[PDB]
Amino acid sequence: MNTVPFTSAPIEVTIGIDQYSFNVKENQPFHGIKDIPIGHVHVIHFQHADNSSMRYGYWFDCRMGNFYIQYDPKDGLYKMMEERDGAKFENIVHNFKERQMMVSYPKIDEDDTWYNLTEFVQMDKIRKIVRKDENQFSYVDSSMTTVQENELSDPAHSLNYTVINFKSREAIRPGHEMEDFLDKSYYLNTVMLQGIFKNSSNYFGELQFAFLNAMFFGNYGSSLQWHAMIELICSSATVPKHMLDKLDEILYYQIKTLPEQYSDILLNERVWNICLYSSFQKNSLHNTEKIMENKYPELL
Amino acid sequence: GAMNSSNYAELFNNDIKLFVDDTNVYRVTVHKTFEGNVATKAINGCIFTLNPKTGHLFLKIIHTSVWAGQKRLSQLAKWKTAEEVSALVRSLPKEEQPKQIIVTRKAMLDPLEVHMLDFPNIAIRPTELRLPFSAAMSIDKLSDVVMKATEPQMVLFNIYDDWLDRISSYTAFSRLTLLLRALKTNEESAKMILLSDPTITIKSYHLWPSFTDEQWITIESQMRDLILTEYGRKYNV
Ligand SMILES: CS(=O)(=O)Nc1ccccc1CN
Structure with missing residues (x-):
């Protein structure tokens, strides 16, 4: 188990750690989060009580370094930093734990939710989408735009998701226009899987990361990317059977975790109705179709 | 965007543009079979591609052989139309290529956009005008050339005569x-x-x-x- 200490909490803030969240009062004696499971990426996220504008946060993996949070009164946010002095860090954490000034990552033993949402997500791939090579962790916020959004504006602060565009020369082979537009298997299997992502695990990792940024930060371009990566699979007539079964599991857990009250803004009616009821894969997503029909029958 | 009564003089300005109407591409007669079921028989059709400023009509005759062995013909017809319009554009010298193509039916937008990806600067637009171009086959000389065709063929006309x-x-x-x-x-x-x-x-x-x-x-x-x-x-x- 690993720990992310906080120097202090000078401003009132709702703090998220993965799918959990808790409120910290202004100047409350809060000094961090302990018992964080090793083996997964994690996200620690923030929404200030006095300005809900800008949710923001940090993706990290405690196996890559010792990380802590410290508020910056000049830039007005909680910042993640790395401590290179290991003995200093261990000493800090021990004192805060002895004084019981930390919240415990509250994982139920039965509960595989976070694994199921991050199965294919790897820090190395996160750091290629979010480019800031001097840190081992990655900052994301509500307002950051994607490379594709910028094409249609600061590049250093962008989300470099893989561009998917169904009406593009990349997606459509000269001479196979109707075939490739109505059956996206070429674009999925040759262009994206063999060419760009190399394997389905990397494709699912990006899909899962896009979902999580959409849900935790309300990041609109991430929501667009998540739906585009679903639609590309559902609109392909030829998809490996193992990918369809895994997609069904991925989507099931994403739909299960989504706050019911955010469904109106996080789910695209056209994409979901097309994917579940018109597409080539309309009968291949049994678990996802069942939870969607029982939880969000309005959207359909 | 779309073309309507507000921007109607745009049709007659000096930017080359073409209307494309696909309503006569896939044409059938419906009849009973000996067993009393219903079947269709295709007849020759045409793409109606018109420059409204000059009157030049590029009439691509669609011979029934293009449907042989094909499925979902009403969908295929839209893609065949877009294929033939794209081929026409590529056949014209650069200075004669349109800057806009206006489709009379919105179902032609995606097929034509996809076929014209190599021409990002040619705008593909719908229209809110209800234009009667389906009646082209009521013009005797156009109907005659379509029905007599034994193979694919493109015939050029001026639909305005000398007006x-x-x-x-x-x-x-x-x-x-x-x-x-x-x-x-x-x-x-x-x-x-x-x-x-x-x-x-x-x-x-x-x-x-x-x-x-x-x-x-x-x-x-x-x-x-x-x-x-x-x-x-x-x-x-
Ligand atoms: C940050 S904190 O200090 O509120 N954490 C904490 C944890 C366990 C029990 C009690 C407390 C503080 N009452």
Whole structure:
């Protein structure tokens, strides 16, 4: 188990750690989060009580370094930093734990939710989408735009998701226009899987990361990317059977975790109705179709 | 964006543009089979591609052999249309290529956009005008070349005959749409109007009769009366 200490909490803030969240009062004696499971990426996220504008946060993996949070009164946010002095860090954490000034990552033993949402997500791939090579962790916020959004504006602060565009020369082979537009298997299997992502695990990792940024930060371009990566699979007539079964599991857990009250803004009616009821894969997503029909029958 | 009555003079400016109508590409007759089921038989069709400023009509004849062994023909027809329009554009010198292609039916937008990805600067647009171009096959010389075709063929016409020597392209387009709307509403009576006077003939190199300016005014009035007459017959007015 690993720990992310906080120097202090000078401003009132709702703090998220993965799918959990808790409120910290202004100047409350809060000094961090302990018992964080090793083996997964994690996200620690923030929404200030006095300005809900800008949710923001940090993706990290405690196996890559010792990380802590410290508020910056000049830039007005909680910042993640790395401590290179290991003995200093261990000493800090021990004192805060002895004084019981930390919240415990509250994982139920039965509960595989976070694994199921991050199965294919790897820090190395996160750091290629979010480019800031001097840190081992990655900052994301509500307002950051994607490379594709910028094409249609600061590049250093962008989300470099893989561009998917169904009406593009990349997606459509000269001479196979109707075939490739109505059956996206070429674009999925040759262009994206063999060419760009190399394997389905990397494709699912990006899909899962896009979902999580959409849900935790309300990041609109991430929501667009998540739906585009679903639609590309559902609109392909030829998809490996193992990918369809895994997609069904991925989507099931994403739909299960989504706050019911955010469904109106996080789910695209056209994409979901097309994917579940018109597409080539309309009968291949049994678990996802069942939870969607029982939880969000309005959207359909 | 889309083209409507607000930006109507845009059709007659100096930016090359084409209308594309696909309503006569896939044509069938429906009939009973010996067993009493229903079957279709395709007949030759055409793509109607028109420059509204110059009157130049690129009539691509769609021979029934292109449907042989194909499924979902009404969907295929839209993609075949887009394929043929793209091929036409590529066949024209750069300085003759359109800057805009206006499709008469919104279902042609995606097929044409996809076929024209190599031409990112050519705008593909719908229209809110209800244009009567389906009635092209009521023009005898166009119907004849389509029905006699034994293979795919492109035939070029000027749909305005020599009218642009005497009238503007705005007026010529208005005359054409009135004639075609009348042929669509009551073909028999419209052709009666156009040919009732044997002393006015159609030149070998023309599609419509050689009416004088005053005769065109009379013809146009009779076509408007025909449209109004049929409107009253339809709605009991
Ligand atoms: C940050 S904190 O200090 O509120 N954490 C904490 C944890 C366990 C028990 C009690 C407390 C503080 N009452």
